[PDB]
Amino acid sequence: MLRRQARERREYLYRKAQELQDSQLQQKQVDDEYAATSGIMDPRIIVTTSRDPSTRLSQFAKEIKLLFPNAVRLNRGNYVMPNLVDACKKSGTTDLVVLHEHRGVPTSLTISHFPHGPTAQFSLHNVVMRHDIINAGNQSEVNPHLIFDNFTTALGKRVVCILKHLFNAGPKKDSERVITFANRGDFISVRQHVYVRTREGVEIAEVGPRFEMRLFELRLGTLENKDADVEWQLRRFIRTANKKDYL
């Protein structure tokens, strides 16, 4: 069993290298990990947190669910990280969401795609969660419409494809829920709206949460595999870090 994953990892690394060369030659479609299941099988997402999560993080983890139609929540009490990924691959889960907080304030969010990656890590700022809204009500859990803004670079499409496949395919044209990821200087604003098509325009309505997402690490492997080759990394000590845009 261990032999199979070891072999497939070598095949996966070879495939990305060949795909990278082909793209570079083209420089002179859907990404391979997702191409097999792109628009064939609906995604399965498992949402978890760090060990001994605070109450707010559990609430925030509950809210990241209602964003994604196919999300399931799992208490990470004493679960060991190789043990977590093996169980999730065993259950057929496609994506794993792990959340980090600091004094009940969400701080980081990492997304790992199974069975062989990729893994993308995000940092959380300006998180405004829905329990903080009084008399807000319940969400609508229909398949939402998706909007992606200002993803122009190759890394721009690359992050979109990761976030794109978290949702189900074939939303109804009159699907009343819309989720937008708006890139603004590498700070991806995430928001959820419900609307009404009016006779002289359209009116939307905020459901929440509000949280600005910035990628800082992207590796070719599962988030457990700390030996995974880094597809891309964020450089903060660069002198042009003051004014560099990637997405």
Binding site: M1, R3, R4, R7
Partner: protein
């Protein structure tokens, strides 16, 4: 693609699928001739079935499960050095 198939296929491709050549790359046996001797003596199982034919070639779904038979004397020396020889599995 078919266009590749007129050049990817080679005699070297078939031989690397040979069980003793599979045996070597896995580091299961030091040398191909050594692998042939073990195959003939019946100390190597591929999934549920034992192979005594060295010329047997392994397919891609199947190489993960090539190993020694449970009661191989070779499989005892394996776990004896590492001091993980469990009698209860009889190996």
């Amino acid at each position: 693609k078919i266009s590749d198939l007129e050049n990817k296929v080679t005699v070297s491709a078939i031989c690397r699928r040979r069980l003793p050549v599979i045996m070597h790359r896995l580091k299961m046996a030091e040398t191909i001739q050594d692998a042939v001797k073990f195959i003939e003596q019946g100390h190597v199982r591929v999934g549920p079935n034992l192979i005594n034919d060295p010329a047997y070639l392994v397919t891609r779904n199947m190489e993960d499960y090539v190993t020694w038979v449970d009661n191989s004397k070779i499989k005892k020396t394996l776990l004896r050095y590492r001091n993980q020889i469990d009698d209860f599995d009889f190996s």
